[PDB]
Amino acid sequence: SASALVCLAPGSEETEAVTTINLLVRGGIKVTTASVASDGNLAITCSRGVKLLADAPLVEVADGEYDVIVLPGGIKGAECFRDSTLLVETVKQFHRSGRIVAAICAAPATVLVPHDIFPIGNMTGFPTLKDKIPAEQWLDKRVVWDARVKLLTSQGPGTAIDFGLKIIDLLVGREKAHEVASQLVMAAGIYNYYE
Amino acid sequence: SASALVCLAPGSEETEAVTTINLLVRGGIKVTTASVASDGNLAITCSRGVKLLADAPLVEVADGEYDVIVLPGGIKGAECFRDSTLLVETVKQFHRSGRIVAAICAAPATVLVPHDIFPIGNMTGFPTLKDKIPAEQWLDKRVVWDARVKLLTSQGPGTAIDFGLKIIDLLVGREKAHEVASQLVMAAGIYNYYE
Numbered sequence: 001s002a003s004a005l006v007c008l009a010p011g012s013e014e015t016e017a018v019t020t021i022n023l024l025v026r027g028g029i030k031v032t033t034a035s036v037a038s039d040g041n042l043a044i045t046c047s048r049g050v051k052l053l054a055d056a057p058l059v060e061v062a063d064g065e066y067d068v069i070v071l072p073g074g075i076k077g078a079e080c081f082r083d084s085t086l087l088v089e090t091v092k093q094f095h096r097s098g099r100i101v102a103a104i105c106a107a108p109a110t111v112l113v114p115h116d117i118f119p120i121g122n123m124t125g126f127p128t129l130k131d132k133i134p135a136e137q138w139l140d141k142r143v144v145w146d147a148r149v150k151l152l153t154s155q156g157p158g159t160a161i162d163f164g165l166k167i168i169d170l171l172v173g174r175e176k177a178h179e180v181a182s183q184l185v186m187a188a189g190i191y192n193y194y195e
Numbered sequence: 196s197a198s199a200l201v202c203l204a205p206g207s208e209e210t211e212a213v214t215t216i217n218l219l220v221r222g223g224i225k226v227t228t229a230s231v232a233s234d235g236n237l238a239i240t241c242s243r244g245v246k247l248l249a250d251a252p253l254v255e256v257a258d259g260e261y262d263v264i265v266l267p268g269g270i271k272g273a274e275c276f277r278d279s280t281l282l283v284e285t286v287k288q289f290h291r292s293g294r295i296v297a298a299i300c301a302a303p304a305t306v307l308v309p310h311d312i313f314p315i316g317n318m319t320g321f322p323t324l325k326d327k328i329p330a331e332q333w334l335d336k337r338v339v340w341d342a343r344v345k346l347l348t349s350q351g352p353g354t355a356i357d358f359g360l361k362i363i364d365l366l367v368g369r370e371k372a373h374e375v376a377s378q379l380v381m382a383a384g385i386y387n388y389y390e
């Protein structure tokens with residue numbers, strides 16, 4: 001199967017993390033969750049208090065051959081990612097080895113921009129953090145797929161379905177993305193991959 | 196200081212549970228999560244494998260004065276609810292005492308219909324299970340609010356935002372629902388409480 005490494009830190013946005021995980025599993029993707037910036041503790045208290053148990057510490061899975069690394073948002077979770085040298089070097093390694101980096105909400109501006117990971121990539125993120133993304137790189141769009149650098153970005157809790165579906169499309173294919181979308185009772189406006 | 200009791204079981208649908216909890220917290224509603232696991236275990240494995248910690252076993256919080264009891268879906272989570280005499284008694288007590296019952300996805304057909312808790316009233320649920328909701332009660336709407344019996348129902352993972360926003364309306368009101376909605380970057384097909 002295709003596989004995904006979903007990172008979690010104290011203060012990660014729980015809808016973004018959980019909805020993404022759920023959709024990837026529905027798509028037949030094996031998902032591992034990794035605890036970041038917790039010195040190995042697998043208990044992760046998210047941004048609105050939801051408490052998740054991660055599968056493993058990042059340091060034990062960072063060298064795995066996952067097809068995508070996923071960075072949920074949440075202000076404080078994204079700061080933890082930014083300030084983790086292991087997280088940043090893992091993101092860089094996924095990219096250099098031809099794999100996908102996927103980031104939502106505050107993660108693009110907080111993690112990718114300060115570390116100059118994708119200096120000329122196109123990206124989106126949470127609208128109120130537009131001023132944290134260099135102006136020439138910013139698109140205000142529910143999902144942005146920059147195929148040149150294999151960078152997938154998205155905007156907020158309410159775009160987590162759109163984000164997860166595009167990961168499925170990229171890793172498994174359009175037909176599987178449509179199958180998953182069809183299970184959800186999605187709002188009008190969200191792309192369902194039928195065409 | 197409105198409050199919500201969100202029930203969780205092995206096999207609950209994690210998007211439905213977590214997105215609902217998230218939105219209620221954003222709305223200033225005090226949330227308590229209650230495990231309906233038969234042994235009282237609080238470390239719940241949800242339908243796609245997300246590991247979610249409940250705050251308390253149902254028996255320790257069921258008699259609380261929460262304004263709403265929330266039943267997430269997930270095929271096996273809803274079966275656990277149906278087969279828990281304490282859960283069913285608690286739902287009945289919320290209803291008889293003039294409080295709100297909120298249920299999504301499989302929870303209406305699996306829990307409410309077999310126990311005949313709402314013999315009169317409109318309801319929805321996951322559309323593949325529509326033939327398990329009595330025909331005179333069924334509506335095919337993203338959210339159904341029947342104020343006559345204080346029953347809120349909704350259809351699936353993709354309607355979790357609509358569901359959570361309606362709980363906010365019912366507990367805190369339209370202004371707060373609009374405020375929360377405006378945070379999410381949600382899709383155009385979800386009612387946003389602005390006129």
Ligand SMILES: [Cl-]
Binds near residue numbers: 040041042
């Ligand atoms: Cl441990």
Ligand SMILES: [Cl-]
Binds near residue numbers: 037038057060
């Ligand atoms: Cl670690």
Ligand SMILES: [Cl-]
Binds near residue numbers: 118
């Ligand atoms: Cl670049």
Ligand SMILES: [Cl-]
Binds near residue numbers: 159
């Ligand atoms: Cl959504």
Ligand SMILES: [Cl-]
Binds near residue numbers: 208269
């Ligand atoms: Cl399910």
Ligand SMILES: [Mg+2]
Binds near residue numbers: 119
């Ligand atoms: Mg620059």
Ligand SMILES: [Mg+2]
Binds near residue numbers: 169174
């Ligand atoms: Mg394609």
Ligand SMILES: [Mg+2]
Binds near residue numbers: 314329
């Ligand atoms: Mg009847």
